[PDB]
């Protein structure tokens, strides 16, 4: 039935839109969280590098 296929298309457009919006929101949040974790790990590593540079200097 044309009307059935037309109904299905209208429904599917709305679903596709909702899926894409949701995925973008998820991906923005996942990126933000991954950056914060990475940044924390970078800062911790840099602290160690600074401690180790001082040790090197003391042993020159």
């Amino acid at each position: 039935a044309f009307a059935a296929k037309a109904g299905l298309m209208r429904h599917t457009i709305g679903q596709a839109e909702q899926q894409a919006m949701s995925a973008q929101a998820f991906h923005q949040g996942e990126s933000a969280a991954a950056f914060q974790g990475a940044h924390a790990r970078f800062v911790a590593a840099a602290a160690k590098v600074n401690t180790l540079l001082d040790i090197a200097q003391a042993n020159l």
């Binding site: 990475a38 790990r41 590593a45 160690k48 042993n59």
Partner: protein, 55 residues
């Protein structure tokens, strides 16, 4: 391109230390080998975190 620069600088520091360090002091809490292991691990962690942050 900071990843490669951090790695190369890190290697230069380690290799300088290896040639300069004629009498490692024990009161600094490690041996040369202990320092080298920790240095290379710190650099790895540092560079991997940077690459995650930027892409």
């Amino acid at each position: 391109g900071y990843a490669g620069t951090l790695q190369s600088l890190g290697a230069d520091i380690a290799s300088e230390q290896a040639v300069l360090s004629s009498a490692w002091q024990g009161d600094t809490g490690i041996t040369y080998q202990g320092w080298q292991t920790q240095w290379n691990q710190a650099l790895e962690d540092l560079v991997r975190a940077y690459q995650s942050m930027s892409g």
